[PDB]
């Protein structure tokens, strides 16, 4: 699945529709980033720039100009075609093919932006710019505005009003279109298949990074070259480190391994976490903690629907957690008192859900304490977890256990659709999967 | 294989040995880099910082202070241990374990560098700083020097002499120690195994990125999580694009595929290029170009030894190339005249070799036109290639052919050792390898 040219047009028009008359929106591409000396990291386009173009090149600027409610045109600044540069650093789109390829009215060379931008802003009343987003963008924009401000004798005028378009554009990104939901759906499938692979390949003696290797390769087999975030493979006590990325230890028989990995498909993020036994068999202690986390997830999956909020569902999860922890002797006291004291905090110290989209931790207003009412089209994760420190003062069998189970869902008219349920999470199903794979 | 604590000590001492008395060398770690929004690229330590520590954390500064020819001490600035930050973004070394772990005399919190650095520089005559390397480092250093310059009433004095240590440190990196050569040797083995995999997995119908996937996974199986540079898989006309990284096309029966990929093992780079037929069988036209490139490589491999230079060996390669191109009718005229005219330039437009080490395009002075005399310990690549544009005015069968064959070598006392010969390059051997793999 993918995003059509029409969709890109719709998005631009939807932004223009909210812009004042006599204004221009400036959206800059992400700059290239050095990995070491003269080598660069694989390029990653700025999410917002990508959202409006699907164009994967740096040194590009999208200019949306609105004359009035029925008139608006676009200008794209991008790298000029250069026989030399291209024979070296890959083919470039250029000005000639840009208009048709990206559906823009006009295309100019990025090398001429300082000679052209002020001319496009001259006479307008408002300019939409994400100030502070990129240093190079601010230089270009500030330089253009200064020329207009100081050019009264040349009859130039600078728009006195500058508005940050991030709030409006991110509000748009918060609601996925059918096309986006289709792409995210494929991202979930690919990511799930990867997690299934990891579970089937896992064997005591293998290192954490080995599972990382299996996962990244599965992403690649389906057209998702890069992960949407650095893969986490924490076995044993490493499972208690929320963003453990070293993945440098030997996985040990008897430990659990927590894998949080997600592919990036057509710019969209998959985000799954599955915790399972390295030897394919949950111990009683591991099961007792796992069950609490799984119930939290399953209940949350049942509750999420339009009308509720992340804050409200989180309340149910906290109750489930405090109750289970008390039954196991990890927490002592009255459930309700413990809840009012957030006694679960030492074991579940992060949120239950976050928006998901072009960025794994997607943009969009959450509202105070993430109280915003959910509506159809919003995409989010559901990731309860329990992490018991190696030195926690609880029964020995629970110390050093880190478990998280995370699925990605899209809110629908009547509830939600689980995009990542194709990879098992019920203990009996996880063991069966691993046992079946081990017959080879 | 790996780098021992002793080696790190030796390197620091070797740098101190070249420093003036009453001076301090400041070596900064690489800053973290954003991939998108709140997600970062996997961390990559600055090569020079790594060379002296093998420490993989950002916000760290190594300070080597030399009192005189027999007295010198070290101070490391690094992130303080924080229960919160670590439960989230991985374990930190901290000040307590640093001295023993990294073999430094003293360790202070990076958060206090602006309150401590000027005190360490006060009274010294010289400070070694790679000015312009990192903006954050320059702020810290300039801030410290200003405090000393303006603090005469507090009896503070700033070293009036600032020296860039890059020339001296890179000259050191230019010559590998036995330990380094052992690590690079393993890097070559791992990289070679990956290229062998790609050749064995290749099938018409597969996409370029699929081979990228096989390669990266093989790197990972042997402990090399990341590539030393972005993998290049150019099939067909894509082979004519030197740094083609899109790897987005379907590999076609009848085309050649050029793969340039290298792992990063213990910070060191592998760098191999192998071009082969997608269908496992070289056509006559493909063979005629391949042979010229292979002869260039084999001859170069025979010539490289102490006493010669990259410039000199390149001369032999140019002769081989011009001769072969004339025999095929791609070039017309007298060999020697064509050579004097660099008539090969349109088909071989890059260098034959580059230093190799902690950076794929390693540091070190090449001398005018890369004329520097080679000595034992230098590590470099040998990568001749011929690229015939799709629209080149030559016999049709040669248009759109891109071939490069690259090996990594270390200059020895009597010649050189090929670190990447474990992956075949002779045509008959490439076809045999592929035919054997295709019986499955």
């Amino acid at each position: 699945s993918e995003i059509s040219r029409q969709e890109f047009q719709r998005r631009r028009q939807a932004l223009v529709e909210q812009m004042q008359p006599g204004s221009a929106a400036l959206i800059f591409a992400a700059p290239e980033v050095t990995r070491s000396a003269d080598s660069e990291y694989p390029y990653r386009q700025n999410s917002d720039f990508w959202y409006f173009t699907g164009f994967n090149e740096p040194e590009a600027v999208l200019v949306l100009i609105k004359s009035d409610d029925t008139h608006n045109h676009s200008v794209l600044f991008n790298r000029v075609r250069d026989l030399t540069a291209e024979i070296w650093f890959g083919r470039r789109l250029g000005q000639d093919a840009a208009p048709e390829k990206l559906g823009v009215d006009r295309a100019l060379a990025f090398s001429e932006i300082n000679q052209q931008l002020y001319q496009l802003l001259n006479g307008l009343d408002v300019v939409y710019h994400a100030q502070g987003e990129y240093a190079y963008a601010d230089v270009i924009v500030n330089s253009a505005l200064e020329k207009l401000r100081k050019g009264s004798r040349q009859n130039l005028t600078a728009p006195a009003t500058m508005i940050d378009w991030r709030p409006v554009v991110h509000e748009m990104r918060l609601f996925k279109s059918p096309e986006e939901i289709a792409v995210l759906r494929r991202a979930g499938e690919i990511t799930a298949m990867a997690h299934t692979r990891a579970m089937e390949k896992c064997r005591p003696g293998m290192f954490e990074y080995h599972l990382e290797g299996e996962i990244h390769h599965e992403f690649n087999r389906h057209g998702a070259r890069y992960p949407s975030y650095n893969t986490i493979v924490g076995s044993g006590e490493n499972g208690c480190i929320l963003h453990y990325t070293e993945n440098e230890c030997e996985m040990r028989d008897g430990d659990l391994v927590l894998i949080d990995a997600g592919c990036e498909y057509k710019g969209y993020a998959g985000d799954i976490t599955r915790t399972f036994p390295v030897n394919g068999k949950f111990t009683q202690a591991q099961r007792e903690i796992y069950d609490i986390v799984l119930e939290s997830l399953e209940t949350s999956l049942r509750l999420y629907r339009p009308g509720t909020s992340i804050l409200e569902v989180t309340g149910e999860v906290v109750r489930i957690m405090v109750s289970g922890l008390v039954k196991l002797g990890i927490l002592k006291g009255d459930v309700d008192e413990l809840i009012a004291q957030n006694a679960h905090r030492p074991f579940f110290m992060h949120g239950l859900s976050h928006w998901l989209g072009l960025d794994v931790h997607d943009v969009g207003v959450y509202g105070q304490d993430r109280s915003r009412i959910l509506e159809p089209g919003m995409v989010l994760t559901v990731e309860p977890g329990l992490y018991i420190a190696p030195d926690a003062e609880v029964p020995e069998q629970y110390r050093g256990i880190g478990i998280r189970i995370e699925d990605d869902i899209v809110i629908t008219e009547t509830g939600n659709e689980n995009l990542t349920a194709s990879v098992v999470k019920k203990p009996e199903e996880i063991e069966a999967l691993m046992v079946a794979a081990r017959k080879q | 294989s790996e780098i021992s604590r002793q080696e790190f000590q030796r390197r620091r001492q070797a740098l101190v040995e070249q420093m003036q008395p009453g001076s301090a060398a400041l070596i900064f770690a690489a800053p973290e880099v954003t991939r998108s929004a709140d997600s970062e690229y996997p961390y990559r330590q600055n090569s020079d910082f790594w060379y002296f520590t093998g420490f993989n954390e950002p916000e760290a500064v190594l300070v080597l202070i030399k009192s005189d020819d027999t007295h010198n001490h070290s101070v490391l600035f690094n992130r303080v241990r924080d229960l919160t930050a670590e439960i989230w973004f991985g374990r930190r070394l901290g000040q307590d374990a640093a001295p023993e772990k990294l073999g430094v005399d003293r360790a202070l919190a990076f958060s206090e560098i602006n309150q401590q650095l000027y005190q360490l520089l006060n009274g010294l005559d010289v400070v070694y700083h790679a000015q312009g390397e990192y903006a954050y480092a320059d702020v810290i250093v300039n801030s410290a020097l200003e405090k000393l310059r303006k603090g005469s009433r507090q009896n503070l004095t700033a070293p009036a002499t600032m020296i860039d240590w890059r020339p001296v440190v890179h000259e050191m990196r230019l010559f590998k120690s036995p330990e380094e050569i052992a690590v690079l040797r393993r890097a070559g083995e791992i990289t070679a195994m990956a290229h062998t995999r790609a050749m064995e997995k290749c099938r018409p119908g597969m996409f370029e990125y699929h081979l990228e996937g096989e390669i990266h996974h093989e790197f990972n199986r042997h402990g090399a999580r990341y590539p030393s540079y972005n993998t290049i898989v150019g099939s067909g006309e894509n082979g004519c694009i030197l740094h083609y990284t899109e790897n987005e096309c379907e590999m076609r029966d009848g085309d050649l595929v050029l793969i340039d990929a290298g792992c990063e093992y213990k910070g060191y780079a592998g760098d191999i290029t192998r071009t082969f037929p997608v269908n496992g069988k070289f056509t006559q036209a493909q063979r005629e170009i391949y042979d010229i490139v292979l002869e260039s490589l084999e001859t170069s491999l025979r010539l490289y030894r102490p006493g010669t230079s990259i410039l000199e060996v390149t001369g032999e390669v140019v002769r081989i190339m011009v001769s072969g191109l004339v025999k095929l009718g791609i070039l017309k005229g007298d060999v020697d005249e064509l050579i004097a005219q660099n008539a090969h330039r349109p088909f071989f437009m890059h260098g034959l070799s580059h230093w190799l080490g902690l950076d794929v395009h390693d540091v070190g002075v090449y001398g005018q036109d890369r004329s520097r005399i080679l000595e034992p310990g230098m590590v470099l690549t040998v990568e001749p290639g011929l690229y015939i544009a799709p629209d080149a005015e030559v016999p049709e069968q040669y248009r759109g052919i891109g071939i490069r064959i690259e090996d990594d070598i270390v200059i020895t006392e009597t010649g050189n050792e090929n670190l990447t010969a474990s992956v075949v390059k002779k045509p008959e051997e490439i076809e045999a390898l592929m035919v054997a793999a295709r019986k499955q």
């Binding site: 949080d260 949120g351 931790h361 990731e383 977890g385 998280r404 995370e406 | 709140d38």
Partner: peptide, 4 residues
């Protein structure tokens, strides 16, 4: 994962 966990919101950073």
């Amino acid at each position: 994962x966990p919101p950073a």
